[PDB]
Design a protein around this ligand. Structure first.
Ligand code: HEM
Ligand code: HEM
Ligand SMILES: CC(=O)N[C@@H]1[C@@H](O)[C@H](O)[C@@H](CO)O[C@H]1O
Ligand SMILES: CC(=O)N[C@@H]1[C@@H](O)[C@H](O)[C@@H](CO)O[C@H]1O
Ligand SMILES: CC(=O)N[C@@H]1[C@@H](O)[C@H](O)[C@@H](CO)O[C@H]1O
Ligand SMILES: CC(=O)N[C@@H]1[C@@H](O)[C@H](O)[C@@H](CO)O[C@H]1O
Ligand SMILES: CC(=O)N[C@@H]1[C@@H](O)[C@H](O)[C@@H](CO)O[C@H]1O
Ligand SMILES: CC(=O)N[C@@H]1[C@@H](O)[C@H](O)[C@@H](CO)O[C@H]1O
Ligand SMILES: [Cl-]
Ligand SMILES: [Cl-]
Lengths: 701, 701
């Protein structure tokens, strides 16, 4: 660049302020251009006069405000994030050249966001939905994102259908009803006309659609990807994030109650858990398969509507992630984060999964919408941990200052920088070299993709009877909300290709004719770890206990408080509830509901709070408590029991149980005198692990 | 423009397609550039091959999809719209030169949007909140927008504080919790440190915060505006939209239930009412005051925290609006609509209200954010009904084609077009000519604005005892959710400057020390039409009745059906509810809740459905119905009664009432034999007008 005076360029770097995190301590307010200000009164022509155009303080403040909002994500708008770390279990170089997997105990920084799918930005956490599980590894060789969900299969087999699925499940276009729900004609029409959807539709109707929290679901990559070794050999892999807390879910009416009582239930759960030191963990696992396995198992590994059963190919544990810090600013870090499945690193490659292939286009393009311009990767949360060097330039919102004035390749002026990186130098990305294609250029679906029903059948067989009833109840609920009889009937006919018992039970729920067995795709096969009831949690850290006490019986508070040490030691929060705040009280009846607690304990001597609605109704007007709605304590109890949660009662607390028709002989009901509270606590710990007592759920066939 | 050949310009208008409403009937799918396509399979290198970059069909479809979203409104994101018409009661030219008010029976097209304030796009309709009431008159002299709310006063006195109020009430910035709610430290901190907020805070805690529907609230302009007559004389006016349905509201726990059962409760209500021919009406009214009235009434008419009591200045009816059509496409017409208080027409002017003055800047600027460019008024819903002519040009998304090549004033080339319009020619806008200012250029608040407490006191005195209890319960609920004791105490102290009884009751609810009377700002004054309980509705059209029946007692359905004619004739929807769809059934237990009905009727012979939760709990597992959660029918009944709704029972239905502890002697409880169903219906019509039976609500002091 310097064989002459003209092309020789003097660089003078200016001492520009380079703040990242903003710290207000000690400061006076300034404009964005650094002039010290107050911001509390408009400049006016006299104190009762009109506001002046020259009040630039007013205009800069309101212009910022008027422009705060950005487009939400077209899908997964409602979500929450956290930072963490990932530790490799091994040097995996034998199967992948990926750097974050290259050594035992190698640690990589992480950022993840969890979300629903269909609802808009402020929709209810406990909507029935798919849930996103999207994690970025900030590796030494680039940001690697696994952008997954809590179900193993997806609804469709080609990315070109994605706007069809999404418009179908989103609110109707004429009136934007209903919010965050598939319970409408268009969605079930789509799922029944596009029968690839059945597998994921069953997942959605199961407890998987309504998880207890982000900490109590698994994550799946869904698609086949490739691990590529340094020498070019590849393996076909499928990812699972196995929650180290375990898998647990709500029941529908409980998910509804939670939506109305605490729309922030899952984001609050994640925030509180991290803030309280109960850091959620998920183990990265992969089914590591050979190229020869593409069609071996009787379905196609390119097909995203199909899971590989653990019993056919086991999951190999790769390493452990932990999320251990909350974001500092939600808008800056969470709202602006843009995950992309095309954010790959050397040692990872794609497959010809037609669903995956289109996602690679879509996510890069969509980042423009939400960020207003092309420099979205420059936002701090999206930056790689090492500095970027390439010949990309300019664009709205450019906050870097390139010094390489020869921004093209090949050139003879820049000393070869930046250098081309590839398989054999600079740890460059490379497509797996044995990949091959051969064929006409076709817009045709592979016939290997044609079985839409067998895997739905396996999934059904994989659920305990209580959760099978839950699926029926959900399908019946959603298809009763569907307004079109012909769609209802199409759904039944589709379900009958999956399992006759399922379809008959649904048709009965809908008041429709019962179909007859259609055995073509039926199977008795089943797989494990795809249900959400009947298997206990692996950790009860960060779960909640509600201890129902009264200010009118002061010893009840003290009884609550003496149990607190035991729960604290298990990482369980004990919440003492009374009518109103007082010494030792944590929360109140008026603020409380069953959904707020994972187990409930009734204190000794407070039985009189637990009047049934019928009793409440006699004495109305005067001398009924104003401090909470009529029969609130009773309702918390009855709801907790109905939902399947452990309930305990100390002393005369058992009177409350009887009032509620709860026999002390039921599973997950613990009783004891005031002298045995220590043992009652440990039984509650026991019940928290079991989590739900499914013997309480009504069964049909 | 043509005294020479060079400046003479040939205009050739091209036959360009000019579709507005899109009609698909008969058509093949095409790209946006008109090439006929299919859109169901990606183009691949072989049927199991990778997707090709040259598949432009895939890319155009996903690029559209990837870019569907736009920024939501910074406030009032959650809302719903409808078209209608406005009829003037008179020629009002004696007080205003406004054209839409210039003749008896003069009709003007309308479009309105109603909304909450704090929640984001998909937040729950029944959040406790301010509600927007924003209406556009498409006049012959421009689009006139009244951008109002359902409360008479606003929280702050200067527009520069608007981002402070909004950041305070919106979710916290670190974690974006909580959604659509003021129940957190920051909001109550703001309301207590910025004590102007007390008036609107009391409105918010009343039933006004939780209306039954958009049809059952009023609208207020809040600010003083001016009517300006042709000759320059002005009047100071305040607007009210008086609902012709009447004012009705929910109770808090009911608003919560509705949020979890039907997040679309208000938008669905409005959509259904219009679709069913029950068109909501609101009468435009104005307090028409003299310039001399600015300080006469012991507060300042420039002050938006102050209402003028109807008893001091009556509302003059101006005309009647009716909303009579749903939008065709929600995104195009509702989401994109941009109302602005600066959208004024000749005969309307502003005042020096410092809150109003800033809104004039803010709304014009904010339209850029949501529309991506400056041509937001070109969107169909924002267009005036007559063609625009001005010298504004260009900008993103320009879909017009100007023919005037001399786009500046003054010029000698364009034949004087377009002509300047003013007070005396072309019906031009004009500022009211007697307006005057005089003063230093000051950033100071007017001392006339200093009384923050007297009007809050009047408002409190204006509520029936039951709604006063509702305010206390709300304040106590929200301030129990506030995590900061010092903020709780500040709120109490502020409330004690308003009314000692109010403050003592709140402090009791919060477990705080009771303050002592602080009489400086106390008053016994009261005003009418500012409460939401204790005054019946004026129309029951579009309200809902739930008729609880059973498939296991088939005559119950027929009993329901024979009542339907009477409800239909009142414009009331009768919904027959059973376990599952069948001949004559409208909805199901599993889909139903108390919030779905405004009155409940229990059929003869179905009492066995109405088992209490206690009874449900005995027989669990087998032979409990799978068709709805345990004790769902009972819960609907108990909830309806608790909320204050009319309930009726035919025949042995009274057994259900007894089970629920509801005596047939209570107000708003109707019973009769199977032979008197006609009379039972008319009593239910009676109860619908009364709407809520406040004798059921617990009272304190
Ligand atoms: C296996 C199937 C899929 C999974 C597991 C998946 C996963 C996800 C996740 C987890 C998010 C949220 C990321 C975040 O938290 O910010 C997301 C967003 C998105 N997805 Fe998907 N997705 C799938 C299929 C598709 C398909 C086929 C397309 C389109 C071709 C697509 C387009 C999008 C878009 C446009 C976004 C918005 C991203 C943004 O604005 O940053 N997805 N997806
Ligand atoms: C008397 C007090 C006020 C009332 C009655 C009021 C009313 C409303 C209403 C009804 C909307 C929703 C319009 C729609 O449905 O699209 C709205 C939006 C808005 N308001 Fe206000 N407002 C008030 C105070 C303010 C103040 C002081 C400011 C700022 C200086 C402000 C800024 C905004 C903005 C930026 C929007 C978004 C508008 C859009 O994106 O189109 N408001 N307001
Ligand atoms: C593809 C590959 O492995 N070979 C290249 C090599 O031919 C080239 O000289 C160098 C710089 O581009 O990068 C490496
Ligand atoms: C999962 C399914 O639909 N069918 C499978 C069948 O393909 C396989 O041969 C057999 C043994 O694993 O298990 C069953
Ligand atoms: C927040 C929670 O779960 N429990 C708290 C406990 O931490 C605290 O020490 C106690 C004070 O009485 O109130 C309760
Ligand atoms: C302000 C006013 O009423 N007077 C004007 C007049 O002087 C002018 O000739 C005409 C065109 O601009 O518009 C009118
Ligand atoms: C509303 C208020 O705070 N005080 C008023 C007082 O100013 C007025 O003189 C009186 C007669 O209307 O009514 C009361
Ligand atoms: C929708 C509604 O409110 N009521 C309907 C009624 O219109 C309809 O004729 C009847 C058919 O059985 O079902 C019920
Ligand atoms: Cl492949
Ligand atoms: Cl003025």
């Amino acid at each position: 660049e310097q064989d002459n005076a003209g092309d020789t360029i003097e660089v003078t770097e200016q001492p520009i302020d380079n703040t990242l995190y903003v710290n207000d301590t000690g400061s006076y307010m300034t404009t964005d251009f650094g002039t010290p200000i107050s911001d509390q009164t408009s400049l006016k022509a006299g104190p009762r006069g009109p506001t002046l155009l020259e009040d630039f303080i007013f205009r800069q403040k309101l212009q910022r405000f008027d422009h705060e909002r950005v487009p939400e994500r077209v899908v997964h708008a409602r979500g929450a994030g956290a930072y963490g770390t990932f530790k490799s279990y091994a040097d995996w170089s034998n199967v992948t050249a990926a750097d974050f997997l290259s050594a035992n105990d190698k640690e990589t920084p992480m950022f993840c966001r969890f979300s629903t799918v269909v609802g808009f930005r402020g929709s209810v956490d406990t909507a029935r939905d798919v849930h996103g599980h999207a994690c970025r590894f900030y590796t030494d060789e680039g940001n690697y994102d696994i952008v997954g969900i809590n179900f193993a299969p997806f609804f469709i087999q080609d990315a070109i259908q994605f706007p069809d699925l999404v418009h179908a499940i989103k609110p109707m276009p004429n009136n934007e009803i209903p919010q965050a729900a598939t319970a409408h004609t268009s969605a079930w029409d789509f799922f029944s006309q596009q029968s690839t959807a059945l597998h994921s539709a069953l997942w959605l109707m199961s407890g998987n659609g309504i998880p207890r929290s982000f900490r109590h679901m698994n994550g799946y990559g869904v698609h086949s990807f490739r691990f590529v070794a340094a020498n070019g050999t590849s393996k076909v892999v499928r990812y699972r994030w196995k929650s180290q807390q375990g898998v647990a879910s709500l029941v529908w009416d409980e998910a509804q109650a939670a939506a109305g009582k605490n729309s922030d239930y899952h984001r609050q759960d994640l925030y509180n858990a991290i803030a309280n030191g109960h850091y959620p963990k998920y183990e990265l696992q992969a089914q590591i398969m050979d190229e020869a396995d593409m069609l071996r198992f009787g379905f196609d590994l390119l097909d995203p509507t199909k899971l590989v059963p653990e019993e056919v190919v086991p999951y190999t544990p790769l390493g452990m992630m932990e999320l251990n810090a909350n974001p500092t600013n939600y808008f800056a870090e969470v709202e602006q984060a843009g995950f992309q499945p095309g954010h790959v690193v050397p040692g990872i490659d794609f497959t010809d999964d037609p669903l995956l292939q289109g996602r690679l286009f879509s996510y890069l393009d969509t980042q423009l919408t939400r960020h207003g311009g092309p420099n979205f990767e420059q936002i701090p949360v999206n930056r790689p941990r090492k500095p970027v060097h390439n010949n990309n330039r300019d664009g709205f919102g450019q906050q870097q200052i390139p010094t390489n004035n020869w921004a093209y390749t090949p050139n003879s002026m820049s000393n070869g920088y930046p250098m081309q990186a590839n398989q054999t130098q600079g740890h460059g990305f490379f497509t797996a070299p044995y990949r091959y294609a051969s064929g006409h250029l076709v817009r045709q679906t592979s016939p290997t993709f044609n079985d839409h029903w067998s895997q739905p059948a396996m999934f059904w067989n994989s659920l305990i009877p209580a959760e099978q009833q839950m699926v029926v109840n959900a399908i019946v609920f959603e298809n009763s909300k569907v307004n079109s009889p012909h769609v209802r009937k199409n759904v039944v006919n589709q379900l009958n290709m999956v399992n006759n018992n399922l379809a008959v039970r649904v048709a009965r729920g809908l008041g429709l004719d019962e179909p007859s067995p259609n055995p073509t795709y039926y199977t008795s096969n089943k797989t494990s770890n795809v249900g959400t009831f009947g298997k206990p949690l692996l950790s009860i850290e960060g779960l909640q206990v509600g201890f129902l006490a009264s200010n009118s019986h002061p010893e009840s508070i003290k009884q609550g408080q003496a149990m607190a040490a035991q729960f604290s030691a298990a990482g369980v929060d004990l919440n003492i509830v009374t009518e109103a705040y007082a010494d030792g009280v944590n929360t109140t009846y008026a603020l409380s509901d069953a959904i707020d607690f994972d187990a409930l304990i009734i204190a000794d001597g407070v039985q009189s709070l637990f009047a049934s609605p019928a009793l409440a109704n006699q004495m109305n007007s005067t001398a009924t408590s104003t401090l909470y709605p009529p029969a609130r304590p009773f309702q918390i109890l009855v709801d907790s029991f109905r939902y399947g949660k452990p309930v305990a009662a100390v002393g005369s607390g058992s009177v409350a149980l009887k009032n509620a028709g709860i026999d002390s002989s039921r599973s997950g009901v613990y009783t004891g005198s005031s002298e045995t509270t220590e043992k009652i606590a440990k039984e509650v710990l026991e019940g928290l692990y079991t989590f739900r007592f499914v013997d309480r759920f009504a069964l049909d066939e």
